[PDB]
């Protein structure tokens, strides 16, 4: 609600501030009952950096900054109650914002786990994470009225790079501590990363989220090519090995709910573009979801364990969806369900990007493909079908529809008639073409009653069950 | 009886953001004088006659829509009751021409110059030709609203609107007492040529649909200060009345200092000067026996507004501290009063809008005395004609002069504080303008039913020019205009003013738009579902919901709908060209959406909510009120009564009703010159007619009103009375006085009940039943009454040719109400035998199928032409005024239907 520049201002200010500071100091001390406590501190460090109307991590254009104690109180003041006089002093050990994003990026880059900066995933982060977005919209960058940003100079720096370097460095963190058993730190550190992904630049999908689902893609892979070779040789030895390929699943799930979530965001920021100059990085990213997609409609054992994942951690996934909104604030199926989830969400969004790829005449061929999924034919089988049947291609001169869609085709910048190459259609086809089918095998899988839970005839038999 | 068809021209009218009225109390003058001169007129262009007419018109009910309208259309000046026009050989009224007698009689032409003069006190309309006197006058009109000069054109016209001093130069003198319009301008707004109550105008990417406009009143000019007159003062704020008085004088010396006036003898604006500040005692006391009261009415104000007014501090209100204005600044006298200091005092935002409250009501005083003393409004200041450009209400004033006024009581109130005397204001209250009639505040827009889908996915977009009341969506074929968007099963919409979904009601649903926002309207009928999008984004539920609407009913299909809230303009993009669609490719086309209109040669065809009321047959399903033909008997006449069906019930619906029948009576062309058993030689030969209207046991007769109605009333009023009803008196005289001629014309021709009841408001409530008689003579034009056999006082003269319905204006208050009784009395004929001509001979009373009971409706839906007159307006220069010109023809087929002379 926006009241912290008229609740937090005389001596709120102090107390707030000694909370933090005690707070941050928590990073020095290793105990095991810190560990425990310090995802709520964080949370809480959060809220108050969000709510909290000085900029603590850039105190020395607090002159500027009109909703702070030094300015409002004469020097007189301040006396009384002892302060040290300068705002530096209010508590030194916080670092600047320029040393702090230092710091993180060093982390970074040098590779560093869980175990050597957990006081940054669980405490530091969160805070610039409330920091950052409130300190832009007041800075530079922000949507200047005319007399507000001609008078008084802006207390903070914050500009979309600080953002955009952060949400690097995160993901960067992440990739590093990618495939360790133990990261319950990814889940919060997602839902506080969420907020900045907005100010998030294009260069970001080339220099980090190509790379990250491209791991984690491979990494699916050859788990489930693991579970075709268990399922080849099927013994008791088969239990053996299962354990392990769920074991891996579950790690994989809970780096993809780490990193899709932001995905999402990014996508909702870039589709338009995406769309309007067609991106070929934006295509090697459906590509990449689309494979992901794939690999869990066939297998039994992934959907389980992102299930499994999803109601242990008691992620919501329909805040992510629809945080938007709620940013803006203007039973087991509700728990998790199949259209919430994560993996069929992203690829839903990125959709529109294959159709774009996919020219209007295509649609036939299209079509084509999807049967011969549907008779569980090869990606290659369906290539030399399309390639053999690619002669059937549409036709515009006998629909009417077709000459404005291939219109707008036209239209597209990026799209150049000779450009349009037979493999480059036949494998076009083939992506759209299976992403779309088994798309249609999750919408509506039939797979309801299987193992019927109305329990009537139960209840019939109530008495003779037991 | 077969429908008549012919081509006719557009005619759109133009006028002056001039608005001028009478009322009680109001501060604005009432004679007033403009000119129009002719540049370029083409006689015939087609083959219909070229239109132009000047006068003017009332805002309240001047709403000449574009193409059909009343009798053959091309409805100007003159075709309704609210205008008064004068094309150069008539009078026009009622949509009625009158010759009229002028030098040089001829039908408007280049190089004439027509001068019109507004006497709002007699109340009159004159003209003079080219600074020739035209020999008649409009009089005795209704004063319900106010009025505005207005042209009415076809195609071929070039004109000058003449308004005086910059916006326009006179050809001719004014005359006496008679003000250009151009001082009528307000001061917030700027002189302009506008249209009248347009739904449409073009822009940048295409037509804009715009709502129905909020206008003013008559009476907003009437200043409303709240009463202060029966209170009581204590003794404290009495003897502050005049430390106050003189404080405030100070202050009002001070303000004029810094903007320079120095010691003068004699108060100027010109002359630089300000006599009274010389010391705060030595100030004359007239401007003390002005502004005593005026510092009084302050705190009687503050006490009537409800806030709680004591003494804080009496050691404050005895000592104070005083800020001395800086020695460095000089005056004349070299002393300067110094006022109390500011900086000690601190007020709450609530002590601002008791600020703003004050300023309002000592405005509202201020304007109202000086208009008691005589003082009028004028955008030019005139002190010895007692014309100010500041004596408007508040509300109408301009943001400098109210800042003044607010930076000025708000120190009064600090200088209060100061004093110690502690205020606490009262809570604040609400408020409901009631600016509009509801069926007048909401247009609809709509695709015609031929455009109608079954199937598909359809895609569609709207722009929201303006950030208030719109809603977006989809409508059934059956749609009724008169209900708000979603408020009923037959529209799927959304509302961006608050973020809803309705059908049904209303549900929270996306985000509110801003300017320029557009809306993406999305129907999939295969999946059955509606979707909603703001540039670009899928709009949401407060859920996970992608879906505005699901599990949607076909049924006969859907088509794009709108509805704009007063002062609101849309933008409607149903995709004939696709390249114009912003947002179509982000959501929509890979989706396979495709544009209502992609393959559509000629751009939808749109119908409208147009709010005229007309008269339509009782629905026979009507939940509230049922009509009942009744058979006559040897004893009874044949009989059309009405019914309650929903009285003394909760639901019931308890509203004036209009009705009329649906057949006329028609007068003759040309006037003559001048037991109880017919006699047949005298039943044969009359040209009388009668009629009666029983009203039952129980219907209050004071609620009902008996008698005729013109084709052309379209009037709807909740809070009916005979004073109500329009009028007007077209005198025709010689050069010099001498009226030949002094006709009135109205619509409506009717009697009270409450004129026919015995005194008895003891026992008001009669198990009588009362039966008023209406007859005419269809040869002398003549109308007259009965009670219960009774002759009535009230008679009527009407002109040959007239049309006549029987009509019947009641508020219920009984299950049964009336009873059209369609008989004779001895030697006069029903008025079967005038409505047919077969029976023109047969005094037998009977009522045919055709003959039904029809009630007035607000709304209708109206097609909207596909093409618009293109009028240019612009300021050809100071001297030469504001130019209006329309030059390219167009034309329309009108379906003419005879018995109600509309089109």
Known sequence: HQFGDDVILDDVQVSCYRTLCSIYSLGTTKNTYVEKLRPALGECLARLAAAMPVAFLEPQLNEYNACSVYTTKSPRERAILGLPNSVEEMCPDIPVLDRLMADIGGLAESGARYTEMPHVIEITLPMLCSYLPRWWERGPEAPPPALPAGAPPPCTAVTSDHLNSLLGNILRIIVNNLGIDEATWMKRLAVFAQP??????????????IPTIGRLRKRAGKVVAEEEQLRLEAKAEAEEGELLVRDEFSVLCRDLYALYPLLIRYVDNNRAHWLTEPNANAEELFRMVGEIFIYWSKSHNFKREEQNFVVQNEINNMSFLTADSKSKMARRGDRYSVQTSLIVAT?????????????????????????????????????????????????????????????????????????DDPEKIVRRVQEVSAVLYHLEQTEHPYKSKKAVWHKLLSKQRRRAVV | ??????????????????????????????????????????????????????????????????????GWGGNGVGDDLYSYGFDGLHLWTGHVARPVTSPGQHLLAPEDVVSCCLDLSVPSISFRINGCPVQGVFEAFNLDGLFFPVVSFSAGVKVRFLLGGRHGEFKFLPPPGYAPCHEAVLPRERLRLEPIKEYRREGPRGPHLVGPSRCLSHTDFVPCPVDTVQ????????????????????????????????????????????????????????????????????????????????????????????????????????????????????????????????????????????????????????????????????????????????????????????????????????????????????????????????????????????????????????????????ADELAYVFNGHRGQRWHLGSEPFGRPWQSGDVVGCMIDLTENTIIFTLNGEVLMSDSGSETAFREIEIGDGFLPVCSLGPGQVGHLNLGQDVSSLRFFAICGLQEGFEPFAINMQRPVTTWFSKSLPQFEPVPPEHPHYEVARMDGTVDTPPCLRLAHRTWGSQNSLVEMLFLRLS?????????????????????????????????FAGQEPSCVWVGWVTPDYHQHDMNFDLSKVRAVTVTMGDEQGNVHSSLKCSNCYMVWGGDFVSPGQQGRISHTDLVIGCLVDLATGLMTFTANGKESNTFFQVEPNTKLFPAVFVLPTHQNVIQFELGKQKNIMPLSAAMFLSERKNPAPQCPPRLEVQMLMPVSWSRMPNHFLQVETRRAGERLGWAVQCQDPLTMMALHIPEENRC
């Open chain 1, 196 to 209: 900045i992904v907005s100010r998030a630049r294009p260069e970001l999908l080339h220099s980090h989220f």
């Open chain 2, 231 to 486: 209170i009581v003062l204590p003794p404290h704020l009495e003897r502050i009345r005049e430390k106050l008085a003189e404080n405030i004088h100070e202050l009002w010396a001070l303000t004029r200092i810094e903007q320079g006036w120095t010691y003068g003898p004699v108060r100027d604006d010109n002359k630089r000067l300000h006599p009274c500040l010389v010391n705060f005692h030595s100030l004359p006391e007239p401007e003390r026996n002005y502004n005593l009261q005026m510092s009084g009415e302050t705190l009687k104000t503050l006490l009537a507004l409800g806030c709680h007014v004591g003494m804080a501090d009496e050691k404050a209100e005895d000592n104070l501290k005083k800020t001395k204005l800086p020695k460095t600044y000089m005056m004349s006298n070299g002393y300067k009063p110094a006022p109390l200091d500011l900086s000690h005092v601190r007020l709450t935002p609530a002590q601002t809008t008791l600020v703003d409250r004050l300023a309002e009501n000592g405005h509202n005083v201020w304007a109202r005395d000086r208009v008691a003393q005589g003082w009028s409004y004028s955008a030019v200041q005139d002190i010895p004609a007692r014309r100010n450009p500041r004596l408007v209400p508040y509300r109408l004033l301009d943001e400098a002069t109210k800042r003044s006024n607010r930076d000025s009581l708000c120190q009064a109130v600090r200088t209060l504080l100061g004093y110690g005397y502690n205020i606490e204001p009262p809570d604040q209250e609400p408020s409901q303008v009631e600016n509009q009639s509801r069926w007048d505040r909401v247009r609809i827009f709509r695709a015609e039913k031929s455009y109608t889908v079954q199937s598909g996915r359809w895609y569609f977009e709207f722009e929201a020019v303006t950030t208030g009341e719109m809603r977006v969506g989809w409508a059934r074929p059956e749609l009724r205009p008169d209900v708000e968007l979603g």
């Open chain 2, 1 to 70: 009886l077969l429908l008549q068809t012919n081509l006719i021209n557009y005619v759109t009218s133009i006028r002056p953001n001039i608005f001028v009225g009478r009322a009680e109390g109001s501060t604005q003058y009432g004679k007033w004088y403009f000119e129009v001169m002719v540049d370029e007129v083409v006689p015939f262009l087609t083959a219909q006659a070229t239109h132009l007419r000047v006068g003017w018109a009332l805002t309240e009910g001047y709403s000449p829509y574009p193409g059909g309208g009343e």
């Open chain 2, 663 to 695: 057949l006329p009576v028609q007068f003759h062309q040309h006037f003559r010159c001048t037991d109880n058993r017919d006699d047949p030689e005298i039943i044969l030969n009359t040209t009388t007619y009668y009629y009666s209207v029983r009203v």
């Open chain 1, 347 to 419: 690829l839903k969004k990125m959709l529109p990007i294959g159709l774009n790829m996919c020219a209007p005449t295509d649609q036939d061929l299209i079509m084509l493909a999807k049967t011969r999924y549907a008779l569980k034919d090869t990606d290659e089988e369906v290539r030399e079908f399309l390639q053999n049947n690619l002669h059937l291609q549409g036709k515009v001169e006998g629909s009417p529809s077709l000459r404005w869609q291939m219109a707008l085709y036209r239209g597209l910048p990026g799209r150049e008639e000779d450009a």
